[PDB]
Design a protein around this ligand. Sequence first.
Ligand code: ROC
Ligand code: CL
Ligand code: CL
Ligand code: CL
Ligand code: CL
Ligand code: CL
Ligand code: CL
Ligand code: NA
Lengths: 99, 99
Amino acid sequence: PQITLWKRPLVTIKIGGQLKEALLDTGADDTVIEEMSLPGRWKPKMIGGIGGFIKVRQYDQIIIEIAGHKAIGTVLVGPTPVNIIGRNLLTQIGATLNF
Amino acid sequence: PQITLWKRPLVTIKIGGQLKEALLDTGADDTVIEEMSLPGRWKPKMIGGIGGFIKVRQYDQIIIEIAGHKAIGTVLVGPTPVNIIGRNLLTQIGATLNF
Ligand SMILES: CC(C)(C)NC(=O)[C@@H]1C[C@@H]2CCCC[C@@H]2CN1C[C@@H](O)[C@H](Cc1ccccc1)NC(=O)[C@H](CC(N)=O)NC(=O)c1ccc2ccccc2n1
Ligand SMILES: [Cl-]
Ligand SMILES: [Cl-]
Ligand SMILES: [Cl-]
Ligand SMILES: [Cl-]
Ligand SMILES: [Cl-]
Ligand SMILES: [Cl-]
Ligand code: NA
């Protein structure tokens, strides 16, 4: 499907067995998800945005469903006010920006 | 025109007669440009993202060119580490997300 940008590009995702809303974000290098109880090994990482950096948990090889597309990759979990799907997973599902 | 996301989606912009590089960011409501001198009336605003908030100058009705496309809209000027083209201008250049 094709998504115009008149509204935030929000989609349903599945992660750890749970349905969530997240923002398709071409301006993000990485995927960051709100604090949740996710199984898997992780390590601490700093990630940055406008306003500086936050401390997140980095989980590798996490299976995530994005608008019905499966993808496996790194997920960061931390105090974001919004779930965002970054380029590391957008590429996995074949997303592109067109105009 | 189609842009894959294996790398940051950066393009050349012209603002205030100066050339700059900016990120096309479907996750950003607003367009934010690094500190520069811009003619025009403006008002203070604070905008928020991953590490929190920054103070910006809001300029309305700025003529800007993005990847060869003309647009006129609101531009926020402030201490962002990366120039960002948000949805307010991406809709004017007819960007869509495909996947
Ligand atoms: C630009 C503004 C209008 C502030 N909007 C936003 O920030 C909204 C805020 C929303 C709510 C909080 C959760 C994030 C979403 C999406 N964003 C946009 C969103 O696209 C935002 C834009 C951006 C890009 C680069 C640098 C700064 C900011 N990207 C990001 O926040 C991602 C997060 C990540 N690490 O994956 N940052 C980066 O990918 C990134 C890249 C280069 C950097 C260089 C120096 C410092 C920081 C850097 N951060
Ligand atoms: Cl809009
Ligand atoms: Cl566990
Ligand atoms: Cl290169
Ligand atoms: Cl000033
Ligand atoms: Cl005006
Ligand atoms: Cl003109
Ligand atoms: Na041109």
